[PDB]
């Protein structure tokens, strides 16, 4: 299975695929408008930031399996590929399309 993660502005959750409730537990609409950094892992937060900064200057990058923080203090080992889409009118970053790949279970 896979999961569509939309990140914009402060890389927050602009939209989350319903399949997120089957992995993290957070209801898709619940992440809408909340800071992703709030639950951006614990010791794997640096990995997210580093990959994020790199992604914003590359367009598309694949982030290795990290401990994704669940709604119950769990760490799901999932891999995610991010692709920042640009607006064709003002020519600027619109939204980041992050494709999550389910591989391992929850730590």
């Amino acid at each position: 299975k896979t999961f569509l993660s939309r990140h914009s502005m402060d890389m927050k959750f602009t939209y989350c695929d319903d399949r997120i409730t089957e992995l993290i537990g957070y209801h898709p609409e619940e992440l809408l408008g909340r800071s992703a950094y709030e639950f951006y892992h614990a010791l794997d937060s640096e990995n997210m930031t580093k990959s994020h900064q790199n992604l914003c200057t590359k367009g598309q990058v694949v982030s290795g399996q990290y401990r994704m923080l669940a709604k119950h203090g769990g760490y799901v080992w999932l891999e995610t590929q991010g692709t920042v889409i640009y607006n064709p009118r003002n020519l600027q970053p619109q939204c980041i399309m992050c494709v999550n790949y389910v591989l391992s279970e929850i730590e």
Binding site: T2, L4, Y15, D18, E79, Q81, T83, I85, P88, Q94
Partner: protein
């Protein structure tokens, strides 16, 4: 207010399984209206094949995003230039396309 950009979970046939609640601010179409419908039905007749062709291309890419620019029909039945970026969700386990998204970014 909502941005003039949205996504939708559709299959290789362009059938919208679930549309994001943002299309209302993009074209004015309600998510439920697209549910069970083909994107080609609300696409410019002369660009319907262009959309179809691009949709087949993304299937050949398997895990890549393809942006197609055409004139989509709004709630007003007008034709506006929109660039739909589709990405093929490939199963990390075995080769298999679950669904394809569609980033509808309004051009000009």
């Amino acid at each position: 207010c909502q941005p003039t950009e949205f996504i939708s979970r559709h299959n290789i046939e362009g059938i919208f399984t679930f549309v994001d609640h943002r299309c209302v601010a993009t074209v004015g179409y309600q998510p439920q209206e697209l549910l069970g419908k083909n994107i080609v039905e609300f696409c410019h007749p002369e660009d319907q094949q262009l959309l179809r062709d691009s949709f087949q291309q993304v299937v050949k890419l398997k895990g890549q995003v393809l942006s197609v620019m055409f004139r989509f029909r709004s709630k007003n039945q007008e034709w506006l230039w929109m660039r739909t970026s589709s990405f093929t969700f490939q199963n990390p386990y075995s080769d298999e396309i679950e669904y394809i998204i569609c980033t509808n970014t309004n051009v000009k």
